[PDB]
Each structure stands twice: as structure tokens, then as C-alpha cells.
């Protein structure tokens, strides 16, 4: 039975829906851990060795730990599941990694992973094909109604304001502008100042924080801008199994629902 290692919980959950146990799906950066700066353990080196296929986000998400993807099983390839996604910069700069916060991009992750599972395990081609279609459809069915709500927003109010710049691909996908306090979790006064200026200038009403960073910068900004603190979004990691976002579909549904519920 083939083993497929995902770099973090979002990709592992996507892969589990496509593979449905036709392969063993393991995860390096488990839910709760930070994909941005992670110490690969000895036990992790075992998962890396057993991997027949390694699925990475790319867009520099894994850059601090790519070095551990070495001394691999012969024939084990590392696949970037964001292939075909036009990168958004952090600034000509380093890519923002958060491509999976997007309905369109969801479909691309699924397709990339479908393609890679099929190349690894061609005798199951027709099952990966069916599974990917079903899962793409589940995603669309859950998320598209949310997109429909949010597209009702008046143009002047088309802003996603967050702490990390985790929503830049969602913004692109749905046609909003995005403001944030820092590009990638792991801070700068000028960015904070710019966010305050921009919020005031545009009458932006809400700023979020996220599940793996501090809410304090967001609350401070909310105060100084006379806006409201939006609450916590899930972007960087699946929640614990009894939390609100234990699956990638649940994560998109939760975060977009909470955004929608702010815009109206």
C-alpha cells in the first residue's frame, strides 16, 4: 500500500478525500503546528522515508524545512500542489503561500493531487477521477453559496482586512481588496500604520485575526480605526477534531461564513 506524505494538515485532508484510503495519507506539519516554522523531528524523518510521494504547497511555504526532504526513497517525487496558480507577492518579491484560501484554487489543489495520485497509482485512475470530482463538487456546493452572499457587497465595502496576509488569494478569487498587518506569521510598525491609514481612509468596518497568531494587534488597530474586531479565522491549520475547522472544507466554510457575516 503506497504512502503519500502531505506537508501540512490542509493538503493531507484534501488528499484523504481524493485517495479515500487507496493510499496511506500522512501529514508532516500536523494540525496545530505552524507550517511557517516547523522543526522536523526524528519521527518525522520516518514519515519522510516511508513516503512514496510527497505533496508540498510550494510558494515557499515549506522553505524552512525543505532541507529535510532529502535522502529520500528511490523514485519518491516532491509535488507542488499549487502548480498553475499565479503567485501573489508579499511586497517583485517572495510569493504569498496562502493559495488554498480560494474556491478556484481549491479546484486546482484537488486536480494537482488527483494527477499526482494517478501517476503514483495508475491502476486506481478511475477511482481518483471519481473521488476528485465528488470532492470538488462538495467544496463547490458548500462554498459557492457563501461566495454568492459576499458578492452582494457594495463595491466601497469590498475589503478583507486581517492580521496575517492570509486572504490575498481569496480577495483575488472573489474580487475584493485585502489589507493586513504582516505578510507571513513569524511584524512591522509601518505596515500597522498603513493599515490604520487605509482603514480610516476607506471606512473599513472590521479587522480579523487568525487561529495561530495574536488577536492583540488586530484589536489595537480596530480601536485606533474606530472599526470592530472581527474575531478569529482559520487559515493556517485545520482545527483539532472537535474544533470548528477539522477538514479543509470546514476551514473554508467557517472562515468564509465568518467573513460573510461581517460584511452584512
Annotated binding site for Mn(2+): 36, 98, 164, 236
Task: Give start and end residues of each alpha helix (H) in 55-204.
Answer: 103-120, 125-150, 168-174, 189-202
H-run or E-run covering 262: helix 248-263
Which residues fall in the annotated binding site for Zn(2+)? Answer: 36, 98, 164, 236
User: Residue 29 to residues 150, 219, 262: CA-CA distances in angstroms?
Assistant: 32, 29, 31
Task: Report d(CA 72, CA 69) in Å as an integer.
Answer: 7
**Contact residues for 1 (Cβ-Cβ < 8 A; gap 6+):** 23, 24
Chain-centre distance for alpha carbon 198: 25
User: Residue 173 to residues 20, 70, 104, 204: CA-CA distances in angstroms?
Assistant: 28, 35, 7, 20
Which residues fall in the annotated binding site? Answer: 36, 98, 164, 236
Amino acid at each position: 500500500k503506497k504512502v503519500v506524505l502531505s506537508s501540512f494538515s490542509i493538503i493531507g485532508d484534501i488528499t484523504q478525500n481524493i485517495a479515500k484510503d487507496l493510499v496511506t495519507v500522512t501529514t508532516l506539519v500536523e494540525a496545530g503546528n505552524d507550517s511557517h516554522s516547523y522543526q522536523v523531528t526524528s519521527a518525522d524523518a520516518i514519515k519522510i522515508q516511508n513516503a512514496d510521494l510527497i505533496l508540498c504547497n510550494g510558494l515557499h511555504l515549506e522553505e524552512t524545512y525543505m532541507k529535510y526532504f532529502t535522502n529520500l526513497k528511490k523514485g519518491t517525487k516532491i509535488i507542488t500542489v499549487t502548480d498553475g496558480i499565479n503567485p501573489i507577492g508579499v511586497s517583485d518579491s517572495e510569493p504569498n503561500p496562502h493559495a488554498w484560501m480560494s474556491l478556484t484554487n481549491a479546484m486546482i489543489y484537488i486536480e494537482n493531487i488527483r494527477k499526482a495520485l494517478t501517476a503514483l497509482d495508475p491502476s486506481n485512475a478511475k477511482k481518483y477521477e471519481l473521488n476528485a470530482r465528488e470532492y470538488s463538487e462538495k467544496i463547490r456546493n458548500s462554498i459557492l453559496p457563501l461566495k454568492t452572499r459576499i458578492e452582494k457587497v457594495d463595491p466601497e465595502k469590498r475589503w478583507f482586512v486581517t492580521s496575517e496576509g492570509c486572504l490575498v488569494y481569496l480577495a483575488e478569487d472573489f474580487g475584493f481588496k485585502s489589507l493586513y498587518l504582516w505578510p507571513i506569521n513569524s511584524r512591522s510598525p509601518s505596515m500597522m500604520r498603513h493599515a490604520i491609514n487605509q482603514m480610516r481612509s476607506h471606512k473599513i468596518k472590521f479587522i480579523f485575526s487568525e487561529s495561530t497568531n495574536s488577536d492583540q494587534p488586530a484589536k489595537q488597530v480596530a480601536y485606533e480605526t474606530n472599526a470592530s474586531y472581527g474575531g478569529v479565522l482559520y487559515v493556517d491549520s485545520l482545527s483539532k477534531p472537535d474544533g470548528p475547522a477539522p477538514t479543509y472544507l470546514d476551514l473554508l466554510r467557517f472562515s468564509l461564513t465568518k467573513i460573510v457575516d461581517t460584511l452584512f
